[PDB]
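Inputs:
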Amino acid sequence: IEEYYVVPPACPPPPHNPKTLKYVPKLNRTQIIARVYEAKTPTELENSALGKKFFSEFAAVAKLVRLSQLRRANVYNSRDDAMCVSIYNTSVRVADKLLHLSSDEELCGLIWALSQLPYPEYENLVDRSLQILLEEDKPLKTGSSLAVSRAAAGLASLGRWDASTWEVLVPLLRKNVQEGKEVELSNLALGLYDARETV
Amino acid sequence: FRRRTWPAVCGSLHIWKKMPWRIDQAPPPMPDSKPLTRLRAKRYEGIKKVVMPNSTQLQFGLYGIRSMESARLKDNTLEAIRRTIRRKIKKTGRLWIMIRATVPMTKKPLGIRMGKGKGSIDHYVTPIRPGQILYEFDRISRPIALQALRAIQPKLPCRLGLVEWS
Amino acid sequence: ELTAYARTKTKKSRAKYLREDGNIPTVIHGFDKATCGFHNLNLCIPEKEANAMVRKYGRNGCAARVVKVKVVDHANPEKVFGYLRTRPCSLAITATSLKLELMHLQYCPQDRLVDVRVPIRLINDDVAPGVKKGGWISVKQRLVGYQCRGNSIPPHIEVDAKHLRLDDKVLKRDLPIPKGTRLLGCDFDAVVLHCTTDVGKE
Amino acid sequence: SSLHLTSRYHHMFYNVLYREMMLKAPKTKVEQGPHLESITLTIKTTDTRLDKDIVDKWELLLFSLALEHITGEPAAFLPPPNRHVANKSAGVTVTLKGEKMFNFLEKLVYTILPNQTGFEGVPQPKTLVPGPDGVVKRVVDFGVTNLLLYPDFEEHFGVFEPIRSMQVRMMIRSDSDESCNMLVSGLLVPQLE
Amino acid sequence: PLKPLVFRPLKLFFWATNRHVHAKVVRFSSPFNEGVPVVDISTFDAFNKLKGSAPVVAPRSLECYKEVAKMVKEETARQNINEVTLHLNSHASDRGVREVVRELKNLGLLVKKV
RNA sequence: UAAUGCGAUAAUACGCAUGACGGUUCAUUUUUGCCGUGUGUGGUCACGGUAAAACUUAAGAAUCGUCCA
């Protein structure tokens, strides 16, 4: 007295049957990044990129960078603060799994974003990013002074004060100041490092 | 107008409300093959005069025959109609039968006075509602359907009509 | 083109007077109350035109067609309120007499998505190995559901049975899918056509 | 403390075997994979020298004691077949989960089954009727016909002489029967096919 | 065999979620009007307090359950509330809720079920 | 109601994560039929009901599936 069961067969969709008749255009990496930055509230930032196809390593960095800008520029209530916490917790965990796929600019932005945000730092996200960029060749070949300026400012705020890394950055920061590129960040980093040397 | 008192409007014990069968508008279900019952019924159970819904159509075939009036048909009548339809249409015809006699009827023998309880089962009947579809056909032509309609009309007490799917 | 007349707000019991005059009540669904003033529009259509449409297309066939509706004043036929593009949805018909009672229509622009139950048609049924042997083609689903755009609604689905033998079955997977439409539901692998010799064992 | 408190198979399943199954059968979610839920050991009257469908409980104490030695956890009497019969049972049973389940499987496969004469492979799984939760489960059933192969019934040979055989069932949760076979193979239990 | 309902001005409510346990004390004037919450303490508040001084494992821990009971006792004592009636529901049988109730009774608050 | 919900050690510190597509379960009273009471040569009558039974097009919510057009 024991009955048995037969699992119904699966239903594969027929070929040449469109999934939707609505117009849903394809999105590339550039479009997703633009969409993420063009956000005004934590809710829009949270919904700017969801799903494993769009919530990639580059999207996680963009969310953290934009979150820092919004946190500094605006004051939020309890509900929005909870939204901000959720954004931070998810983005860092994604970064901890796809860190090896990040580019030089993304790593530089990640360090700057983590320094500004007040939430607890994840396991070793800053240290891992430093190790990948510690070859001393990526900073030298970093054509965009923005990435170098963000990295220099981030470490100064975090108080790393690495002797080797700073020595390389000093001539680069001075060159950027002479060229008039990223003066505010370069000057801020140089001033902070000079203060540390005095102290 | 509804015949109830104020306490009934608020604290009625009739929580599960079912519409009585005599006036329910739901179409009857397809006949099954269950055996006929041996439990006597009441005369109302074999009669129903409410019309069919205004959305009834053919379900399986392309042609069919409907009743324009209510009636109560016995088992003997259906058997004669079935033979007439089968002979008239063909052996190679598709026929759906949508009716069946299932309500028992009682009768008492001659020479018995009134009283001393209800009688014993004698035959079975089925109620027919106005506009109801009785038979459906397929694998035939329209002229053949008309011939079937004319063959059975003299054998039934109600007016009949033709239905087509479109 | 169909002609419709405006109505006053009346009770359900006043509908039988319109039919006696020779008009059938109609309702057009699918408007925006903010910009049009109503979510639904009530009118009446002459019975003579209504019967011609049903006969020409059919009770279920007309649901896959697009029609034009002109609204005019009943007292003055030359006063035109406007024009609408709609598709029939359902028809209410008496069971005892087969007369129209109420017509449901949907406002169907050329850029809207609608669900339509399209009838299935057969081609070259006479020339088929199964028919020659002595079988017949049995249709199990007269209508099949599709999601179509307003500008492209298939009048019917053409299924060719010129190369079907006995026991051949055509499932939903094999049905044509014209441009601008997709199959609805998930119950694929459902029998639509069947070439057999059984006659129901009657 | 010179006591057996760990589980070798438990470490193997989660730290070694689980990843391999994921690579062989990719799934969208991590938890979507083969899992072993419980193992049930049953001894009925038909597997004993006693010849009767319904027997008194005092006659089944010996078999209940035998399961305790094999499993290390007390066993329970089967429910009476009807309310009229109260003091008579029809066998004993015990259910194991977690670390205790894995330890029993390791000992059975490594030592006892290889020494059983007519063993080729365990039967194919059978699918049961889903319960109210709607989860499909497969069961693999086999029996051990020589219970005197364990090294524990030697201390009192006369006491455990009547012990003859036992039945074993394993419950597995997986997406398909093929996944069940993959898990069984990972457990080092040959399957008869 | 459901008992008749009895109206009480002060009632104690518990809401047990996946992560925390919430306790509220609400005053009522009639069943037809909304109440006024006078105490609102959850294990979230206790976790933030203890973690700074004494490390705890998680909000749903024995240390936090006792801490929540203590904080509830202080608020009721300050407002001169000594007797409350507990509202019984499915969440009332949670292990975390039962620990809080036991602590409250030992502290001195009189909690009645009926 | 993100101090949410769900989980295959199921405990909750850890895992999935609030968008987007697809499939399921839930307004001129939508307006026709139908039912009840009153009156009636058996209907060219009146009012009400259907949150009792048949019948329209939506929009939203709750799961579920998904590297996402």
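The longest helix of chain A spans residues 78-98. Flag for discussion at group meeting.
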